């Protein structure tokens, strides 16, 4: 039995990707698989009063399909909370209430996606020109192959932690900060550094603020305070699906420019409300004359090792051009993410891949990886595709269009 | 051929009928009629900058079916603007965007509307009990007369002038501005009076303000100044549906406390906005030395007459408890609206609907008129049930659950 | 030892009083007395995130004297934190800020205040007519008279439980809310009634949903929800300085609209801000399936009683006209307050003093109660004026232009 | 008659020097010579809805003076405008207004500024080492030389045209925008190209579509849309007096992280507001099927020359790596402006200021240049020290603090 298309990861990606197969009247065969007991959209960040970065509208399915049954609109309907959410008047969702929004689509879904299934490699199908790949899948029980004539790898962001710092049973990437910080007792982390300056490290610091009013913190980035996101209507504008086309035909001159210019509208920076929540509180805590944030600006965490009681954090100063150290019981690097990359996953297939000058996967409109005549078999990327398609990539700005391109080149080669 | 439903009038409470009857599996004859060329949705009124007082979520279809093909979401899409409007992340379309809507929806949908059609009188079918009634519709051309066993009727609000003023050439009705103010030479209104302290009130005076730098405008009311419109979420859940069954059910006494407490949700009050654009540019006149805006509070208007070249308006001083004259050459009276009244065009029909103890029409929940056995035909209200179903009735509200709900009483009774 | 001036009190409007005068180039003597160790200014409110309800602008002397040594800005500036509170961009201190910002003032203030000092009485001084009154000041080791020309009543708003309902163990004023709770295990608590939709109301049902994460509230209001505060420019202009001689000088007629028309400036309603963060509040919990806060709205709490381990409150609904009973652990009445009355401490000077058509106090337009001829001392209200100064009396909005002003009065009668 | 200090140039920053002078109880002598006949602060760019892009807290004084008699507080007072500003309730004046505090506060000043008098030289005074500069000042009649024992250079931004385009008739400059346009018929400006995407930028084209309904506008700027200017409260703090101490004593490595991560405080960058207004301008005449507004993004002008009745505009694409031509009847560069550079004015005392590496003035943390120990006499800068001193420099964040600031730098000499 050979599947048409074959889904690695099933996050908010590859899940709009099943619903574009849904929705779609071409008849095509799919399987996806899911590493975890079931949908895990960064549980570790699912903080209290985190906020979606994206409007509601941008969903699953409405950019392509304004009357979607998998629309937030829809599940907000089935949730009868329609009108309550309409009340609000904000564009914004929290992200408890997308996580459930995720797996209302995905039980509404007819397809059934494949869980503890883990992706271990994807090899060449029989034949040449190869036109089929094998998927080797691994669960708790067994391990199995799937053929497939075209695979979708999303299998999203990659951890990433500063040079020189290892995650430990002290050190925590942010990605993992709530797996850690359920576990260990509240009162033996009454000093908690964080490495960085955006988002994540924004809402953690926020939160060990909220949790206990005895928690010190000390927020180490490279800036001199929290840079606000930008989100303003024209610089947005890059997240348009059409603007996915004007990067992607673009020259590298105008690709860089994206970068050079609007950054700011994801990377490194943090939600105007974060942002003056944190300060409303440090100016209270002055006000009472208990100071308990700390922000250590102009600076970077380069080491930490645990000494006795302690984890010791080595943090160098720009401004005085030394480092030194700095004890607490937990340092969290909430120091982002690298882009993913469907390398380590292709194994031999990368051969028949092309890169291009900077050494990166070469890709097409379409989002299926450019590949040497020797492979025939479709390669589709949702994420990894910064440097092609731009700042969208990794986001969910674009999941509606996305899917429904990828699904519409699926079937224009089948046929 | 004697229809199921007759609609008279065709402003967005209709048409959102006419889609609820679409939409509906039931198979359901209707006609409707509108006495304008076309749908015409408070023209006089399309200022430059009008914005709707109600979420883009509440339109004609989405909170009864989150999928319509008819809602405003599908309107921006087909159009080409749902990307750029998302980018906005403002709920309140223009009016201007709405109007368009309303026209869009129109052309969308199957049936096909008789324009320059006016209901005359509706009468009595033949028969007893009455099972049936006659539409009088006076076309440009002809005359004619239509049979249904169900009218719907919906003719919207209805201008009211202050006590002791009638319209003229030169005395305006707000929802006449545009018509009036076209026709006009700029260089002869110079000097305007504006009567009222509400929504359309302060739409005309910051036009007028924002139009010529030199007209000099007197906006006469009798608050203090400008009161704010609430729609913050808890005062803003009398519009809910299910705030329809709590105000229905609910005694005379809690019937009184919805008026009391949330009048201000929606009468004699203007968007925070709009009060502070006029604020500003009041101060910025100041600064200036060229004040225009004369702001005459705690005041009404109490008469107008023309005597030359002037208008004079009196007005009555609460504050000197005595009146005065003042010369302008428009007095524009925004002084609001009375509700829907079925009454006029029942004419013999009418001694069959029965009253309540105030003198007003009593209606059924599902928006039914009470009728003695003598008339078993359905009659209908959209507008009008100020009384029986509360704040929401003249407003965009609720249209989705009203014309389902309707459409569902007339189905249920055929049979 | 006779003073020029004596004030009964020493909350903002006294302190403000004490400021004019120092300010003043008159060489006024005068004693302060305070009943309390310090200022307290309801202390049994100051919830953590508590905001000022009046701009920083209005502070005990800026309207009048716009440098100060005693404005808002100077304390900032000694306190180091200007730049910080400027980077805000915040009109609206916190209580915490505010409360300490009046103790600042009264530790510059050259003259010493009386503290543990409670006015039992004033009396007629002797001499015919009475030139000066004698104040009976009770301190906890003794008792003694002091004698003045003048005398400031200024002792607050006076908590107001509802009908029926008497302040006991388990059933508290909001006012003295903290008192209360620091005293109660918190495991104790976690069933709270709380009765009232005005500003009190909504900061301690707030308080409670942040304090605790398993308490369960009852909010018990008339309103079908908050209504919002109106603060918006135009409405704002009833706390002007000069809207206190339109209000005055108005016609009973005027001064009924001030209340028919923006009541909602302070009474019964609630700060936006507030009121989005509970709806927020609410959705969460509703989101996560474990809802703590019960609106009970058109509803008035009408009983209270103890049974063994409960507080019975009965609750009259409006809807249903009729009553049921509630069992919680504390009952909270947030149910506002009265205006100051110099009735009581006036004793036998009421005689000289002069009533209006309704009963109430007349007083002039400098805040000096219209007295017979008998009385020549000066008796001035700041407080209790609402009925002849406006809306401002008991507020903040006023206390640089007000105190200015009973200064003169007083420094133009010595001459 | 030798001053102990001279002023060149008499904007904010002179006249904030003239009052920290007046308010210091240290004797120093003084003049100040402005070119312009009067104070003019940026008058072509003094479009109609111009805001202040600064806190009304940051005036010319009250950071330093809490209680200064020429604060913005101090100014609304005298002008009966403080009530009506505070009910505003927002932080940012107009630059109007600011304009009119600037020309109020120059009024109040004792001291009298020498208008019409343009600084063409600054020599060394007789003897060695050099104790005093002598300051050639050219009038409309006559010539004349000061001797002076300081000098502060404030004479302002320099416009910046792009690199191969010069003024003309046709080319502005966006600093005399106003200037050209008030000369020149209505009906002639119906195309106009504006370069940019800075505030100056988005000013112009949101005046431009707002003042004629049928101007046709191209906004070329090099961004993909306009960026959001950052004054979120921690970025913010890069304006604080202490962050100068920051800037000052950090290596040039934390000194370029401030630009690296802040230079969207300020620069090319636009107000929030504005950004929107824009956006539902460009939104408006969409829906009205009427654009207006054609934004030419990853673009750069390079290139402008007369050709008959147009100006024609050399466009470079940078997503196409190619120019082209554009014709307009106005080209204006809202292209920015170089920091103050003392330099020119130097002349022959330049050989003994002492540079750094890259070739610019060093200057102490009191402002006052470097010079070898043949010039004794203080020269000091207002403007110019983005390098040393950061982004405050040509801003109006820090007027208080620095002429403070430079005035104790002078008594402690003196001394
Ligand atoms: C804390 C936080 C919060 C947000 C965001 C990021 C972060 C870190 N994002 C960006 C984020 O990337 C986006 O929300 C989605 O997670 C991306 O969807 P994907 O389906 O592509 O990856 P995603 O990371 O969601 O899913 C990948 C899945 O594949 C699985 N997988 C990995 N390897 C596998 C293998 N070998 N075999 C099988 N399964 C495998 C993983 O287990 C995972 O379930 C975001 N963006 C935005 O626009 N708005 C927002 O609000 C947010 N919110
Ligand atoms: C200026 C302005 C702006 C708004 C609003 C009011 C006003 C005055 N409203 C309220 C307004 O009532 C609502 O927008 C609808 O117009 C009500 O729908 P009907 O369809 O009920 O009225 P309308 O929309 O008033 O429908 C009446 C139609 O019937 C026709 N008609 C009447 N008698 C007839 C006859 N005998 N024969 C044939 N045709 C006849 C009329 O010509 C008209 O076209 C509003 N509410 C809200 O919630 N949000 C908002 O943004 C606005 N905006
Ligand atoms: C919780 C809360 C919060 C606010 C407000 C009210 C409440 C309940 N208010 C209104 C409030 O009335 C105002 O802030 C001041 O408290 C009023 O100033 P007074 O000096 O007139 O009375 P205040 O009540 O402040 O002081 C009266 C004093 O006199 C003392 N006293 C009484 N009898 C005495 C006696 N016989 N002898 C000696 N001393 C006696 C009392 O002990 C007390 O210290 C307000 N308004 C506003 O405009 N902005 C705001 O932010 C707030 N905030
Ligand atoms: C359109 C616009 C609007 C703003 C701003 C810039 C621009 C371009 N700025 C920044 C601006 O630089 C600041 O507001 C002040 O103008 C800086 O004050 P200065 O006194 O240093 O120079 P400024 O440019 O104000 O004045 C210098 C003066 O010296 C005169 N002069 C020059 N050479 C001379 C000579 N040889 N002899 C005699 N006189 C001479 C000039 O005539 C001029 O009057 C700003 N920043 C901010 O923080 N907030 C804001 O809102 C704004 N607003
Ligand atoms: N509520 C939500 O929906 C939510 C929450 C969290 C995250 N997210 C999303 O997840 C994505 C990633 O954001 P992120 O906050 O996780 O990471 P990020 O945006 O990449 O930012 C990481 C931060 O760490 C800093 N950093 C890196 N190395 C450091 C070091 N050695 N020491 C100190 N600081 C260091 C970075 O500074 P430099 O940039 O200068 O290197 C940067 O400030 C974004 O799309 C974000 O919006 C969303
Ligand atoms: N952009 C939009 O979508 C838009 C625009 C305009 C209107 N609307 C809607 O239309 C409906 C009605 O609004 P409206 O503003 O037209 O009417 P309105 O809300 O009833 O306002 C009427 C006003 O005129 C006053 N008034 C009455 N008689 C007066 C007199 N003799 N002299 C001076 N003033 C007098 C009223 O005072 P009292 O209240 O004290 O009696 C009140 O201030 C609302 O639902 C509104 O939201 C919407
Ligand atoms: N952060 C702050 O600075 C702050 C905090 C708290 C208060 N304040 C100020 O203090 C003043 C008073 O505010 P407030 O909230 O204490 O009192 P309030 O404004 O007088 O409100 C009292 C509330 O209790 C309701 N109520 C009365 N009797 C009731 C009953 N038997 N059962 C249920 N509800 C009942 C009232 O309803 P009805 O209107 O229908 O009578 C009203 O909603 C205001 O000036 C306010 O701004 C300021
Ligand atoms: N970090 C998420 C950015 C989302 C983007 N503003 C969008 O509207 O798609
Ligand atoms: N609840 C106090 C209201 C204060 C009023 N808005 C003022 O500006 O004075
Ligand atoms: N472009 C002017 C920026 C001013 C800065 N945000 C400040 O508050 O000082
Ligand atoms: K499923
Ligand atoms: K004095
Ligand atoms: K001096
Ligand atoms: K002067
Ligand atoms: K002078």
Redesign the interface.
């Known amino acids: 039995p050979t599947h048409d298309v074959v889904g690695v990861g099933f996050g908010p990606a590859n899940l709009s990707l099943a619903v574009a197969l849904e929705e779609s009247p071409a008849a095509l065969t799919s399987a996806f698989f899911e590493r975890r007991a079931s949908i895990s959209w960064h549980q570790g960040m699912l903080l209290?009063?985190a906020k979606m970065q994206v409007?509601f509208?941008?969903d699953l399915a409405?950019?392509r399909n304004?009357?979607?049954?998998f629309?937030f609109?829809?599940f907000?309907?089935?949730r009868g909370?329609?009108?309550?959410?309409?009340?609000?008047?904000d564009?914004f969702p929290?992200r408890?209430?997308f996580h459930?929004y995720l797996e209302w689509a995905e039980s509404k879904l007819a397809h059934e996606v494949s869980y503890d299934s883990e992706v271990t490699a994807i090899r060449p199908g029989p034949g040449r020109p190869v036109d089929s790949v094998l998927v080797d899948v691994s669960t708790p029980e067994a391990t199995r192959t799937v053929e497939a004539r075209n695979i979708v790898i999303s299998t999203g962001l990659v951890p990433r932690m500063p040079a020189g710092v290892q995650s430990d049973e002290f050190v925590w990437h942010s990605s993992r900060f709530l797996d850690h910080f359920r576990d260990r007792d509240p009162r033996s982390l009454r000093r908690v550094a964080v490495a960085g300056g955006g988002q994540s490290a924004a809402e953690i610091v926020r939160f060990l603020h909220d949790n206990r009013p005895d928690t010190v913190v000390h927020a180490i980035m490279?800036?001199?305070?929290?840079?606000?996101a930008?989100?303003?209507?024209?610089?947005?504008?890059?997240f348009?699906?059409?603007?996915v086309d004007?990067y992607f035909?673009?020259?590298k001159?105008?690709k860089d420019?994206?970068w050079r210019?609007?950054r700011?509208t994801n990377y490194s920076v943090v939600d105007?409300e974060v942002?003056?929540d944190?300060?409303?509180r440090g100016?209270?805590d002055?006000?009472?004359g208990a100071p308990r944030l700390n922000?250590v600006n102009?600076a970077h965490v380069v080491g930490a090792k645990r000494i006795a009681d302690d984890t010791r954090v080595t943090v160098y100063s720009?401004?005085?051009?030394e480092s030194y150290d700095l004890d607490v019981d937990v340092l969290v690097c909430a120091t982002g993410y690298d882009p993913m990359d469907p390398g380590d996953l292709l194994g031999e297939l990368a051969e028949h891949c092309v890169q291009d000058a900077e050494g990166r996967w070469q890709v097409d409109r379409d989002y299926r990886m450019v590949t040497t005549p020797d492979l025939r078999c479709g390669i589709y990327l949702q994420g990894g595709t910064e440097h092609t398609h731009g700042l969208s990539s990794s986001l969910l700005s674009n999941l509606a269009t996305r899917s429904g391109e990828i699904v519409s080149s699926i079937e224009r080669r089948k046929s």
Chains 1, 2, 3, 4 share one sequence.
């Not at 909370?81 to 008047?89: C, G, P």
């Not at 490279?222 to 606000?228: D, E, L, N, R, W």
């Not at 348009?240 to 603007?243: C, E, H, I, N, T």
């Open positions: 209290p009063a409007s509208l941008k409405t950019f304004p009357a979607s049954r629309s609109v829809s907000l309907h089935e909370r329609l009108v309550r959410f309409a009340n609000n008047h564009f929290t408890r209430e459930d490279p800036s001199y305070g929290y840079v606000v930008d989100n303003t209507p024209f610089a947005n504008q890059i348009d699906p059409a603007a004007d035909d673009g020259s001159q105008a420019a994206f210019y609007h700011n105007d942002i003056r944190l300060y409303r100016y209270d002055e006000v009472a922000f102009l720009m401004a005085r051009e």
